[PDB]
Amino acid sequence: FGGNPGGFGNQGGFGNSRGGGAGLGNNQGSNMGGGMNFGAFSINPAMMAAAQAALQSSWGMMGMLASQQNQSGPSGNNQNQGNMQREPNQAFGSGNNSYSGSNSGAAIGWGSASNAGSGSGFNGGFGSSMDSKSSGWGM
Amino acid sequence: FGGNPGGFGNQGGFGNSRGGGAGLGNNQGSNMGGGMNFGAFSINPAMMAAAQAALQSSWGMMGMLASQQNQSGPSGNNQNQGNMQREPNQAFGSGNNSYSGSNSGAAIGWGSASNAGSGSGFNGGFGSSMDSKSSGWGM
Amino acid sequence: FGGNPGGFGNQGGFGNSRGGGAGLGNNQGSNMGGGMNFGAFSINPAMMAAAQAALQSSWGMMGMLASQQNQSGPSGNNQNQGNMQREPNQAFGSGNNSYSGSNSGAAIGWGSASNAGSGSGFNGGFGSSMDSKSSGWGM
Amino acid sequence: FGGNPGGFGNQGGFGNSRGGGAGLGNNQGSNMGGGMNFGAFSINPAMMAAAQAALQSSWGMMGMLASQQNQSGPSGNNQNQGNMQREPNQAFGSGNNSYSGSNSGAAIGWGSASNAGSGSGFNGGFGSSMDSKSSGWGM
Amino acid sequence: FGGNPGGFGNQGGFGNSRGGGAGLGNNQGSNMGGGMNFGAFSINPAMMAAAQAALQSSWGMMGMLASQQNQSGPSGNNQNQGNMQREPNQAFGSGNNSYSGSNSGAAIGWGSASNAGSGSGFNGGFGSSMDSKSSGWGM
């Protein structure tokens, strides 16, 4: 009860980005300021893949092909024009004006995580916690 | 109950980015300021891959192909024009005006994590924590 | 119950970026200021890969192909035109106006992490923590 | 229950960036100021790889191919035109106007980490912490 | 239960960047100011690699191919036009106007780390901490 996954045959091209002819015959790329300018993209990762346990794997692409996952923090105004306090005492948290913003990215793939906490608490912990045990052929 | 994953045959090209003809025949690249300018991209990572335990692997691309995951901090105004305090005492946290911003990137892939905390707390911990145990052929 | 993953045959080209013809026949690259200017890119990492335990591996590309993950800190104004305090005492945290910004990059790949804390707390810890145990053929 | 991963055959070219013909026949590269100007890129790292435990490895590229992960600190204005204090006492943290910015890069690959703290706290620790134990054929 | 990963055959070229013909036939490189100007790049690190435990290794490229990971510190203005203090006492931290910026690079590869702290705290520690134990054939 084992396996033998294989037996593949191709006869034509394979991932051959043959850019021919007059196409692409004149590139005029200009950049200014920050940012980037490009000319063209031909991405053809053809592949021939075999395995006997494709476990939690990815065989094409994973993350982000054309995506604007851009992040911006607070833009408003925090005005604090007076807080008459006479005498606090042992005040662990008091009188705290907090204008806070928090952003996290897309959690893509196995066992990912995006945690975003904002405000005036969150004591007693934060963040991810992962215990991974991966064994090929093993316990 | 083992395995023998293989037996692959190709006859044509393989990942051969043969850029021929008049195409690409005139590149005019200009840059100014920061940032980058490029001419063209032909990326054809064709491949022939075999394994017997493709466990938590990636065989094509993973992260980011064309992506604007750019991050900007606070842009607003924090005005603090007075806080009449007479006498605090043992004030661990008091009177704290905090204009805070926090951003994190995309967590892509296995067991990644993006934690973003912002504000006036978060004592008693922060951040990720990972215990990985990977064993090929082993326990 | 072992293995023998192999048996690959190719007959054509293999990752041969044969840039021929009139294409690319005239490059005019100009740069100014900071930043970079390039001419063209032909990246064809074709490969022939075999293994018996592809565990948490990557066999193509991983990180960032064309990406603007650029980061900017605070841009707003922090105005503090008065805080009448008569007598604090043992004030561990008090009267703190804090305009803070924090950014982190994309956490790509296995067991990565991007932590971003900003504000007026975060005592008692920060940052990642990883205990890795990898054993080939071993416990 | 061992292994023998191999048996690869190629007949054509292999990673041979044969740039022929009139293409590339006239390069005019100019630079000014800082920054860089280049002419063209033909990167074809074709390879023939075998192993018996590809554990947490990378066999193509890893980090950053074309990426603007550039970082900028604070750009706003911190105005502090008065803080009438009569008598603090044992004030560990008080009266602190702090305009702070913090950026971190992309954490790419296994067990990486990007920590970015900014503000008015973070006592009692910071930064990463890693305990790695890797054993080939061993415990 | 050992191994014998091998058996590779090539017949054509191998990483031979044969730049022939009229292409590249006229280079005109000019530089001014700082920075660099180049002519062209043909990078074809073809390779034939075998192993029996490719553990936490990299076999192609790792770090940065074309990347603007450039860093800039603060650019804003820190104005401090008065702080009427009569008598502080034992003031470990007080009256501190701090305009601070901190940047870190991309943490690429195994067990890397980029820590960036900025502000008015961070006592009681900072920075990375790593305990590595690598043993070939050993405990």
From Swiss-Prot, chains A, B, C, D, E:
Annotated consequence of substituting G19V: In ALS10; a patient with bulbar signs and dementia
Subcellular location: Nucleus; Cytoplasm; Cytoplasm, Stress granule; Mitochondrion
Annotated segments matching region Interaction with UBQLN2: 1-139
Compositionally biased residues, Gly residues: 1-28
Phosphoserine modifications at: S17
Skewed-composition ranges (Low complexity): 67-83
Entry comment describing in which tissues the protein is expressed: Ubiquitously expressed. In particular, expression is high in pancreas, placenta, lung, genital tract and spleen.
Modifications the protein undergoes after translation, according to the UniProt entry: Hyperphosphorylated in hippocampus, neocortex, and spinal cord from individuals affected with ALS and FTLDU. Phosphorylated upon cellular stress. Ubiquitinated in hippocampus, neocortex, and spinal cord from individuals affected with ALS and FTLDU.
Outcome reported for the amino acid change (mutating G12S): In ALS10; loss of ability to negatively regulate the expression of CDK6
Effect in UniProt of substituting A40T: In ALS10; triggers mitochondrial DNA release into the cytosol, which is then detected by CGAS, leading to activation of the cGAS-STING pathway and autoinflammation; slight reduction in interaction with PPIA/CYPA
Disease: Amyotrophic lateral sclerosis 10: A neurodegenerative disorder affecting upper motor neurons in the brain and lower motor neurons in the brain stem and spinal cord, resulting in fatal paralysis. Sensory abnormalities are absent. The pathologic hallmarks of the disease include pallor of the corticospinal tract due to loss of motor neurons, presence of ubiquitin-positive inclusions within surviving motor neurons, and deposition of pathologic aggregates. The etiology of amyotrophic lateral sclerosis is likely to be multifactorial, involving both genetic and environmental factors.
Job of this protein: RNA-binding protein that is involved in various steps of RNA biogenesis and processing. Preferentially binds, via its two RNA recognition motifs RRM1 and RRM2, to GU-repeats on RNA molecules predominantly localized within long introns and in the 3'UTR of mRNAs. In turn, regulates the splicing of many non-coding and protein-coding RNAs including proteins involved in neuronal survival, as well as mRNAs that encode proteins relevant for neurodegenerative diseases. Plays a role in maintaining mitochondrial homeostasis by regulating the processing of mitochondrial transcripts.
Domain characteristics, as noted in the entry: Consists of an N-terminal domain (NTD) and two tandem RNA recognition motifs, RRM1 and RRM2, followed by a C-terminal glycine-rich region.
Subunit structure: Homodimer. Homooligomer (via its N-terminal domain). Interacts with BRDT. Binds specifically to pyrimidine-rich motifs of TAR DNA and to single stranded TG repeated sequences. Binds to RNA, specifically to UG repeated sequences with a minimum of six contiguous repeats. Interacts with ATXN2; the interaction is RNA-dependent. Interacts with MATR3. Interacts with UBQLN2. Interacts with HNRNPA2B1. Interacts with ZNF106. Interacts with CNOT7/CAF1. Interacts with CRY2.
This protein's name: TAR DNA-binding protein 43
Lineage: Eukaryota, Metazoa, Chordata, Craniata, Vertebrata
Gene: TARDBP
Residue span relative to the full protein: 276 to 414 of 414
